[PDB]
Amino acid sequence: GSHRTSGRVAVEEVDEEGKFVRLRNKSNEDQSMGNWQIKRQNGDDPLLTYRFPPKFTLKAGQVVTIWAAGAGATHSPPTDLVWKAQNTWGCGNSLRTALINSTGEEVAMRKLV
């Protein structure tokens, strides 16, 4: 899919089955992601927003997968986090997933069409 990565963290994969979104710190430096968020736009549906914990660090070169509540995954930081507010990330023909920092700036995205 389409994508953009500014900074250390990229949206590496967006599951078409809506079970997860995987991010990867492609840099050699750790990244603070406290209060960051992921905005998901499925087709013409209202935006879904996942917020990272108030404190969280994605270490250099590492990945973190954010699972929806009905994906059969267990909260296991720092490699896997579970989003309790939504059972699915959503499915469709056009899915846009954006990684937003703590001040509202989009730093990365991945879009499927």
XYZ file of C-alpha atoms in Angstrom:
113
model
C 0.000 0.000 0.000
C 0.842 3.702 -0.070
C 2.966 4.986 2.779
C 5.034 7.766 4.271
C 7.483 7.761 7.154
C 9.000 10.893 8.634
C 11.150 10.297 11.660
C 11.905 7.048 13.425
C 8.620 5.113 13.352
C 6.805 3.662 10.343
C 3.417 2.002 9.922
C 4.818 -1.307 8.668
C 1.625 -3.270 8.129
C -2.123 -2.762 8.215
C -4.037 -6.026 8.476
C -6.757 -6.266 5.831
C -8.740 -8.413 8.272
C -8.670 -5.481 10.692
C -7.060 -7.397 13.540
C -3.929 -5.290 13.956
C -1.649 -2.427 12.934
C 2.101 -2.993 13.261
C 4.630 -0.199 13.692
C 8.399 -0.371 13.436
C 11.093 1.916 14.752
C 13.418 1.760 11.739
C 16.023 4.006 13.373
C 18.937 3.372 15.712
C 17.369 5.551 18.429
C 14.520 4.862 20.863
C 11.289 6.780 20.321
C 9.006 8.145 23.027
C 5.390 7.584 21.998
C 3.530 8.552 25.144
C 0.212 10.142 24.182
C 0.760 9.413 20.488
C -2.208 8.049 18.555
C -3.270 6.130 15.480
C -6.110 7.472 13.346
C -7.944 4.994 11.146
C -10.209 5.975 8.263
C -12.173 3.093 6.742
C -13.896 4.120 3.538
C -16.321 6.902 4.417
C -16.853 5.799 8.017
C -16.215 8.110 10.988
C -12.593 8.180 12.152
C -11.424 5.655 14.735
C -8.733 6.733 17.180
C -6.400 4.584 19.259
C -4.345 6.431 21.864
C -1.010 5.157 23.118
C -0.440 4.870 26.873
C 0.597 8.058 28.679
C 4.087 6.551 28.764
C 5.573 4.234 26.144
C 8.907 3.780 24.407
C 9.427 1.928 21.134
C 13.085 0.919 21.189
C 15.439 1.278 18.244
C 14.790 -1.217 15.465
C 11.832 -2.770 17.297
C 8.207 -3.365 16.365
C 4.975 -3.008 18.298
C 1.667 -4.460 17.184
C -1.563 -2.833 18.315
C -4.336 -5.429 18.323
C -8.074 -4.805 18.244
C -10.075 -6.293 21.147
C -11.529 -9.206 19.175
C -8.310 -10.436 17.568
C -7.561 -13.117 20.152
C -4.399 -11.325 21.252
C -3.305 -10.601 24.824
C -1.860 -7.341 26.157
C 1.866 -8.080 26.259
C 4.014 -4.923 26.279
C 6.228 -3.797 24.842
C 5.754 -5.995 21.756
C 1.964 -6.231 21.666
C -0.689 -3.827 22.927
C -4.439 -4.410 22.942
C -6.976 -1.723 22.031
C -9.955 -2.323 24.324
C -12.286 0.318 22.874
C -12.733 -1.401 19.487
C -13.165 -5.067 18.532
C -11.782 -4.423 15.040
C -9.670 -1.834 13.218
C -12.214 -2.058 10.415
C -12.225 -3.480 6.885
C -12.972 -2.206 3.398
C -11.600 -1.173 0.012
C -9.830 1.956 1.264
C -8.170 1.964 4.685
C -5.956 4.855 5.825
C -3.918 4.438 9.014
C -1.980 7.418 10.358
C 0.522 7.623 13.206
C 0.167 10.955 15.043
C 2.568 12.367 17.643
C 1.596 13.955 20.973
C 1.007 17.371 19.396
C -1.276 16.222 16.587
C 1.182 16.007 13.702
C 0.988 13.043 11.321
C 4.447 11.455 11.279
C 3.698 8.318 9.269
C 0.922 6.559 7.411
C 0.011 3.536 5.339
C -2.994 3.401 3.048
C -4.591 0.468 1.259
C -6.770 1.021 -1.812
